[PDB]
């Protein structure tokens, strides 16, 4: 049981070669030679170039093109409760019939 002498010798040689190769895989301090050439504030600019401009574009598109055609934007009619007043008409909605309130 165990390694034969040939196995030991081959393993030792292979691991020495592997360690040499792995050491050769390293990088020199100047190894990545990069060739140079050129041709609140961060959040402030981000909120303008990523939020404000899309809001402007979509508001224009919805207000002046989408709504230019009928039935493109349909709103569920607001809920109506007794005692409310309609802005368009100004008439007051009749209240309830004074149901008997007890507990």
């Amino acid at each position: 049981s165990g390694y034969t002498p040939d196995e030991k010798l081959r393993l030792q040689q292979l691991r020495e070669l592997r360690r040499r190769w792995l050491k050769d895989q390293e990088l020199s301090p100047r190894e990545p030679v990069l060739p140079p050439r050129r041709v609140t504030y961060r959040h402030s600019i981000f909120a303008v170039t990523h939020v404000l401009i899309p809001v402007w574009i979509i508001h224009y598109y919805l207000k002046y093109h989408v709504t230019a055609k009928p039935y493109t934007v349909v709103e569920r009619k607001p809920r109506i409760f007794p005692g409310d007043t309609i802005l368009e008409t100004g008439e007051v909605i009749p209240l309830m019939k004074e149901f008997p309130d007890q507990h």
Binding site: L14, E31, P32
Partner: protein, 178 residues
Amino acid sequence: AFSAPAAYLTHQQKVLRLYKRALRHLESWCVHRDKYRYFACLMRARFDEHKNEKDMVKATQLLRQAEEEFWYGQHPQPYIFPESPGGTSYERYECYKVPEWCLDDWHPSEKAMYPDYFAKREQWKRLRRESWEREVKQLQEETPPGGPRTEALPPARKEGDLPPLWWHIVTRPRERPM
């Protein structure tokens, strides 16, 4: 993995493999350390009551019945190491292993970066270039007539020689290349 396999497994090897499997599945069953240690010592003792069995026809019947018992209580969800062939991270980084010869296809602009590494790369390539020519002759002279019997390779026997068929073993990419 690194060692070549044999034509068959002896009784000793089968006994050792069964013992290791039983211990692993026992520690899978016995989660806690003290309980596992107690039951592992107990199972080593019950495995040891038949060490000195002499006749082989009776020692093969003991292990044959031990393989019928292990299967019955083998914990259908055993513990597996993460990098083992059944683990959760077995071949996780297998797609990051890029062969070395790919560097031969790099553009000269890319090879302008990292000059020392590439210089060492031609050094290694030349070393392999002479080494392979030596190893063909060495392996042809050392092989027995009719072809090899086991896939175990001989080492280098001279001074400047290198072990035959060494390029693709030492140039493994890495364990975690990226």
